[PDB]
Amino acid sequence: SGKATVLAVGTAVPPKEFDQSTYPDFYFNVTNCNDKVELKGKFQRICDRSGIKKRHFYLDEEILKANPGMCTYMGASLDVRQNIAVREVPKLAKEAALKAIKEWGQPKSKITHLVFGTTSGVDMPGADFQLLKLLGLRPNVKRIMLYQQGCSAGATVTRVAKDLAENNPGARVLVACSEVTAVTFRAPSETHLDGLVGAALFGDGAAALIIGSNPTPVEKPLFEVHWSGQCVLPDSDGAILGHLREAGLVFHLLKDVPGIISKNIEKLLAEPLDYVKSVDEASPAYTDLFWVVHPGGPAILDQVEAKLKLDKDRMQATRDVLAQYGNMSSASVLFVLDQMRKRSVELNKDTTGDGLKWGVMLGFGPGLTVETLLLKSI
Amino acid sequence: SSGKATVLAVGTAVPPKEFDQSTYPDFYFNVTNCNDKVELKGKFQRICDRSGIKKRHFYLDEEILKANPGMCTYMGASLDVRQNIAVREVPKLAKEAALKAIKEWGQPKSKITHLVFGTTSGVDMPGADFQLLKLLGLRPNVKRIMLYQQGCSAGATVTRVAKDLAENNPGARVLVACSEVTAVTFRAPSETHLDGLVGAALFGDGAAALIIGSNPTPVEKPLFEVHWSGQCVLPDSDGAILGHLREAGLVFHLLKDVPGIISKNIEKLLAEPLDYVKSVDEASPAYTDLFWVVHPGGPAILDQVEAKLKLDKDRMQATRDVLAQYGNMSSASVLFVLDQMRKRSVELNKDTTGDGLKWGVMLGFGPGLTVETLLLKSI
């Protein structure tokens, strides 16, 4: 009752598709690293088992050529990366938001709050202001701009929107996450093998939501947000580091992220499952929940599926997003929320959440931090 | 008049090294090897002389700067060393302010449920919010909101954010911290960048922290209640303050009269919170019947709002006290003013924490031009 409710979802990607099978050829070509046959072979193997069929990128041969800094491994390049990201992140978000807003069907003057998440560049005024402007929202929309957040921020913006919507009568929150790999793209290097991983998995994309409490008769609820939590996992210090430098944004992976999440995932779920027990007086198996999971990559999905003994269909909405768009950082989990709803229509499900009642939304980022939200289907 | 997010503690911290504003231009034009720029230095001395600042505190000094010549140039590449400094020092300064807040609060730190961190000084992953969680040893399941690259309005933003966290979650106690270090903005003066001289005159280092929660217990000590909160972009202000993060650091551009724009629109901003006060109290205070917790952007903003609203000269005094002793510490500043409001209430034997008055306005200003407005109630 009065719970923050997802009322619309919209998504956007750059038009240009990069087929994953051939991406090594393109990548090692533009970075003039063709002479590194053993490294290229390693990269092709990573791409081949990534579970990704294609990614969408704003970045193309023309732009990368016009800006050779970005085609180096660690040369100066932040300024052109910023020029690109500061401009394109809000633009891609407007596209997603206009689709959310259409779905919602209400006038945009009714939007009272905006939460913007990204890991791709920073500016003042922020991407949140640029989007307010691009959409012609009211000037007194209350904004929260979440910069440099990482892959957990799709979940983070839903958590933030939940308290805005629930504590403010009438509030209608526009949530937008938008990412463009302009700030992380770099030449592959034998001295940065963990860097191959991001190069294989990260793609561009934006996703938006409308969230509000007390949906009106003309609004259409998709999911309810019942419980929200965040935590730093044990023995995970330094797992993912991301340093914004003159060379742009560099990642360092120093621990087994899939394994750590796997190791702790039952613990993470304990309280949201207590809450369900409080309301439904029952205790579902993990496989009796639907899953809206950040597609960090195939290994996290496989190992959580194995650990929690999930029917193979449960990760399917997540893997669908991974297959078609790769890892778009914070926007990704909201793409999965959309896909979850889309398949409920196509596969004639009894609810928006794979025909089940309760669902788990999960995002993962530097910390190692996990965001957990308990959803209810409609 | 029950359940409103309440300030339960305030703590502040600044780097120990003090720089007298009178002689700041000597130091500044010297470490940047710009002594030949004598007319420029004259302009800067004048700007510093009318700034209303007696001293600032800085982490940066001659030794650090000389060890990092990139930072003493006008637009030379230096983001890497600036980040090295900011990513380290921003959460450390925040920790000191936060310990003071937690001390005043009086409760175990395990009862902290949320952390909101604001800064304009560097970015890292994990963020300064994570760093501060670790430095304080809070529970790993404290709920964090990390606000990077925000600018001068973020002291008020984190208070708007904390209000909803506290009010929608029963027994929530929110640690709020803003922390700023000028390592990312410091650079050589230049006749090509005259608006850079404003920032060089005004900006200082500092951090501040609150504890905020709804429904204070009898062992907690309320300072201020947050009754209303708004944020708005001002009309005809497009491009007034730009801030770009580049390879040479954070660069600021001032393309419009920020004090004029704020003054031109201030009464309109206040209409809605004053309607709230009319609804609750059935009468309309004059602006000078409120207490004022204002971001000390610089002397001109304070002077012009004071005049526009016909404020008694004493209303802006807590704000001016912070400008005098610390300068413009970006996001943190308005929370120093909140502290100073309470402090002068004790020492001047006021009837309430808010200069003896019931209702108060909190104002933060930043790029957009954005204004954060909060209505406070004193205790």
PDB file of N, CA, C and O in Angstrom, chain B residues 4-9 101-108 111-113 171-174 211-224 379:
ATOM      1  N   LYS B   4       9.157  15.494  11.243  1.00  0.00           N
ATOM      2  CA  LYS B   4       9.976  16.173  10.270  1.00  0.00           C
ATOM      3  C   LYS B   4      11.432  15.767  10.501  1.00  0.00           C
ATOM      4  O   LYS B   4      11.817  15.556  11.657  1.00  0.00           O
ATOM      5  N   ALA B   5      12.194  15.586   9.409  1.00  0.00           N
ATOM      6  CA  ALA B   5      13.623  15.290   9.511  1.00  0.00           C
ATOM      7  C   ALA B   5      14.265  16.339  10.374  1.00  0.00           C
ATOM      8  O   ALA B   5      14.007  17.526  10.199  1.00  0.00           O
ATOM      9  N   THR B   6      15.063  15.914  11.339  1.00  0.00           N
ATOM     10  CA  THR B   6      15.653  16.841  12.277  1.00  0.00           C
ATOM     11  C   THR B   6      17.160  16.742  12.340  1.00  0.00           C
ATOM     12  O   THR B   6      17.700  15.644  12.370  1.00  0.00           O
ATOM     13  N   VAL B   7      17.834  17.892  12.335  1.00  0.00           N
ATOM     14  CA  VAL B   7      19.274  17.948  12.607  1.00  0.00           C
ATOM     15  C   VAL B   7      19.526  17.710  14.107  1.00  0.00           C
ATOM     16  O   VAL B   7      19.024  18.461  14.946  1.00  0.00           O
ATOM     17  N   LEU B   8      20.358  16.702  14.420  1.00  0.00           N
ATOM     18  CA  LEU B   8      20.631  16.211  15.773  1.00  0.00           C
ATOM     19  C   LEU B   8      22.069  16.508  16.178  1.00  0.00           C
ATOM     20  O   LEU B   8      22.440  16.466  17.359  1.00  0.00           O
ATOM     21  N   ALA B   9      22.905  16.784  15.187  1.00  0.00           N
ATOM     22  CA  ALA B   9      24.294  17.132  15.436  1.00  0.00           C
ATOM     23  C   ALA B   9      24.873  17.789  14.232  1.00  0.00           C
ATOM     24  O   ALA B   9      24.419  17.542  13.136  1.00  0.00           O
ATOM     25  N   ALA B 101      30.433  15.172  14.823  1.00  0.00           N
ATOM     26  CA  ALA B 101      28.973  15.038  14.748  1.00  0.00           C
ATOM     27  C   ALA B 101      28.449  13.845  15.546  1.00  0.00           C
ATOM     28  O   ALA B 101      27.465  13.943  16.261  1.00  0.00           O
ATOM     29  N   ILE B 102      29.121  12.716  15.433  1.00  0.00           N
ATOM     30  CA  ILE B 102      28.699  11.505  16.109  1.00  0.00           C
ATOM     31  C   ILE B 102      28.876  11.684  17.601  1.00  0.00           C
ATOM     32  O   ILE B 102      28.027  11.174  18.399  1.00  0.00           O
ATOM     33  N   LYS B 103      29.967  12.353  17.991  1.00  0.00           N
ATOM     34  CA  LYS B 103      30.187  12.628  19.417  1.00  0.00           C
ATOM     35  C   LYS B 103      29.011  13.414  20.000  1.00  0.00           C
ATOM     36  O   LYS B 103      28.458  13.073  21.078  1.00  0.00           O
ATOM     37  N   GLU B 104      28.676  14.515  19.349  1.00  0.00           N
ATOM     38  CA  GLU B 104      27.580  15.373  19.807  1.00  0.00           C
ATOM     39  C   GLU B 104      26.275  14.595  19.865  1.00  0.00           C
ATOM     40  O   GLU B 104      25.485  14.716  20.822  1.00  0.00           O
ATOM     41  N   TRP B 105      26.043  13.819  18.819  1.00  0.00           N
ATOM     42  CA  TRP B 105      24.860  13.003  18.712  1.00  0.00           C
ATOM     43  C   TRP B 105      24.686  12.123  19.936  1.00  0.00           C
ATOM     44  O   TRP B 105      23.609  12.128  20.532  1.00  0.00           O
ATOM     45  N   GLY B 106      25.749  11.413  20.324  1.00  0.00           N
ATOM     46  CA  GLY B 106      25.796  10.731  21.609  1.00  0.00           C
ATOM     47  C   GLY B 106      25.498   9.239  21.537  1.00  0.00           C
ATOM     48  O   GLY B 106      25.614   8.517  22.544  1.00  0.00           O
ATOM     49  N   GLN B 107      25.170   8.775  20.339  1.00  0.00           N
ATOM     50  CA  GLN B 107      24.698   7.412  20.070  1.00  0.00           C
ATOM     51  C   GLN B 107      25.763   6.556  19.415  1.00  0.00           C
ATOM     52  O   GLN B 107      26.692   7.077  18.787  1.00  0.00           O
ATOM     53  N   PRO B 108      25.647   5.234  19.561  1.00  0.00           N
ATOM     54  CA  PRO B 108      26.668   4.392  18.920  1.00  0.00           C
ATOM     55  C   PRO B 108      26.595   4.532  17.408  1.00  0.00           C
ATOM     56  O   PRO B 108      25.491   4.770  16.847  1.00  0.00           O
ATOM     57  N   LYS B 111      24.203   2.700  15.029  1.00  0.00           N
ATOM     58  CA  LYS B 111      22.808   3.089  14.778  1.00  0.00           C
ATOM     59  C   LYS B 111      22.662   3.966  13.526  1.00  0.00           C
ATOM     60  O   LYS B 111      21.552   4.396  13.198  1.00  0.00           O
ATOM     61  N   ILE B 112      23.781   4.270  12.860  1.00  0.00           N
ATOM     62  CA  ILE B 112      23.725   5.035  11.637  1.00  0.00           C
ATOM     63  C   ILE B 112      23.249   4.079  10.534  1.00  0.00           C
ATOM     64  O   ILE B 112      23.795   3.009  10.354  1.00  0.00           O
ATOM     65  N   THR B 113      22.199   4.459   9.833  1.00  0.00           N
ATOM     66  CA  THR B 113      21.585   3.623   8.795  1.00  0.00           C
ATOM     67  C   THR B 113      21.872   4.087   7.360  1.00  0.00           C
ATOM     68  O   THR B 113      21.781   3.299   6.403  1.00  0.00           O
ATOM     69  N   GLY B 171      13.021   5.160  12.430  1.00  0.00           N
ATOM     70  CA  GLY B 171      14.306   4.962  13.111  1.00  0.00           C
ATOM     71  C   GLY B 171      15.595   5.163  12.284  1.00  0.00           C
ATOM     72  O   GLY B 171      16.705   4.846  12.757  1.00  0.00           O
ATOM     73  N   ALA B 172      15.463   5.669  11.060  1.00  0.00           N
ATOM     74  CA  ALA B 172      16.625   5.973  10.238  1.00  0.00           C
ATOM     75  C   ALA B 172      17.400   7.114  10.861  1.00  0.00           C
ATOM     76  O   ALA B 172      16.813   8.120  11.250  1.00  0.00           O
ATOM     77  N   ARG B 173      18.708   6.939  10.911  1.00  0.00           N
ATOM     78  CA  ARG B 173      19.647   7.993  11.299  1.00  0.00           C
ATOM     79  C   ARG B 173      20.684   8.144  10.211  1.00  0.00           C
ATOM     80  O   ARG B 173      21.430   7.185   9.906  1.00  0.00           O
ATOM     81  N   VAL B 174      20.742   9.348   9.654  1.00  0.00           N
ATOM     82  CA  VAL B 174      21.503   9.635   8.418  1.00  0.00           C
ATOM     83  C   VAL B 174      22.734  10.447   8.777  1.00  0.00           C
ATOM     84  O   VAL B 174      22.635  11.544   9.354  1.00  0.00           O
ATOM     85  N   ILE B 211      24.107  14.737  11.682  1.00  0.00           N
ATOM     86  CA  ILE B 211      23.261  13.576  11.887  1.00  0.00           C
ATOM     87  C   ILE B 211      21.847  14.070  11.740  1.00  0.00           C
ATOM     88  O   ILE B 211      21.456  15.049  12.372  1.00  0.00           O
ATOM     89  N   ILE B 212      21.082  13.396  10.893  1.00  0.00           N
ATOM     90  CA  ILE B 212      19.690  13.756  10.672  1.00  0.00           C
ATOM     91  C   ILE B 212      18.749  12.585  10.881  1.00  0.00           C
ATOM     92  O   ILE B 212      18.997  11.499  10.399  1.00  0.00           O
ATOM     93  N   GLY B 213      17.644  12.826  11.567  1.00  0.00           N
ATOM     94  CA  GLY B 213      16.649  11.793  11.773  1.00  0.00           C
ATOM     95  C   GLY B 213      15.308  12.374  12.132  1.00  0.00           C
ATOM     96  O   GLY B 213      15.217  13.495  12.613  1.00  0.00           O
ATOM     97  N   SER B 214      14.266  11.608  11.871  1.00  0.00           N
ATOM     98  CA  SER B 214      12.916  11.920  12.290  1.00  0.00           C
ATOM     99  C   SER B 214      12.612  11.316  13.661  1.00  0.00           C
ATOM    100  O   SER B 214      13.139  10.264  14.023  1.00  0.00           O
ATOM    101  N   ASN B 215      11.713  11.967  14.383  1.00  0.00           N
ATOM    102  CA  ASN B 215      11.278  11.504  15.710  1.00  0.00           C
ATOM    103  C   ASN B 215      12.434  11.310  16.687  1.00  0.00           C
ATOM    104  O   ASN B 215      12.742  10.200  17.088  1.00  0.00           O
ATOM    105  N   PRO B 216      13.070  12.412  17.076  1.00  0.00           N
ATOM    106  CA  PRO B 216      14.160  12.359  18.052  1.00  0.00           C
ATOM    107  C   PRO B 216      13.679  11.694  19.334  1.00  0.00           C
ATOM    108  O   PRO B 216      12.526  11.891  19.735  1.00  0.00           O
ATOM    109  N   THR B 217      14.534  10.851  19.906  1.00  0.00           N
ATOM    110  CA  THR B 217      14.270  10.242  21.202  1.00  0.00           C
ATOM    111  C   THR B 217      14.612  11.222  22.328  1.00  0.00           C
ATOM    112  O   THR B 217      15.243  12.254  22.101  1.00  0.00           O
ATOM    113  N   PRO B 218      14.188  10.895  23.564  1.00  0.00           N
ATOM    114  CA  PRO B 218      14.467  11.840  24.649  1.00  0.00           C
ATOM    115  C   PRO B 218      15.935  11.983  24.989  1.00  0.00           C
ATOM    116  O   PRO B 218      16.256  12.871  25.761  1.00  0.00           O
ATOM    117  N   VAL B 219      16.823  11.193  24.398  1.00  0.00           N
ATOM    118  CA  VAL B 219      18.251  11.290  24.724  1.00  0.00           C
ATOM    119  C   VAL B 219      19.016  11.944  23.607  1.00  0.00           C
ATOM    120  O   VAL B 219      20.240  12.150  23.697  1.00  0.00           O
ATOM    121  N   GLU B 220      18.293  12.250  22.538  1.00  0.00           N
ATOM    122  CA  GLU B 220      18.818  13.021  21.425  1.00  0.00           C
ATOM    123  C   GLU B 220      18.464  14.485  21.657  1.00  0.00           C
ATOM    124  O   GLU B 220      17.560  14.790  22.434  1.00  0.00           O
ATOM    125  N   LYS B 221      19.220  15.377  21.032  1.00  0.00           N
ATOM    126  CA  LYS B 221      19.088  16.806  21.236  1.00  0.00           C
ATOM    127  C   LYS B 221      18.891  17.505  19.884  1.00  0.00           C
ATOM    128  O   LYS B 221      19.849  17.811  19.177  1.00  0.00           O
ATOM    129  N   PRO B 222      17.626  17.784  19.530  1.00  0.00           N
ATOM    130  CA  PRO B 222      17.322  18.489  18.276  1.00  0.00           C
ATOM    131  C   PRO B 222      17.875  19.890  18.182  1.00  0.00           C
ATOM    132  O   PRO B 222      17.794  20.653  19.154  1.00  0.00           O
ATOM    133  N   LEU B 223      18.405  20.218  17.009  1.00  0.00           N
ATOM    134  CA  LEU B 223      18.911  21.558  16.714  1.00  0.00           C
ATOM    135  C   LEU B 223      17.957  22.333  15.769  1.00  0.00           C
ATOM    136  O   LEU B 223      17.627  23.481  16.018  1.00  0.00           O
ATOM    137  N   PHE B 224      17.555  21.693  14.663  1.00  0.00           N
ATOM    138  CA  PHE B 224      16.742  22.307  13.626  1.00  0.00           C
ATOM    139  C   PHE B 224      15.864  21.232  13.005  1.00  0.00           C
ATOM    140  O   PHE B 224      16.313  20.096  12.830  1.00  0.00           O
ATOM    141  N   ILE B 379      14.821  25.225  17.396  1.00  0.00           N
ATOM    142  CA  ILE B 379      14.454  24.511  18.613  1.00  0.00           C
ATOM    143  C   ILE B 379      14.617  25.503  19.765  1.00  0.00           C
ATOM    144  O   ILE B 379      15.595  26.264  19.781  1.00  0.00           O
TER     145      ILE B 379
END
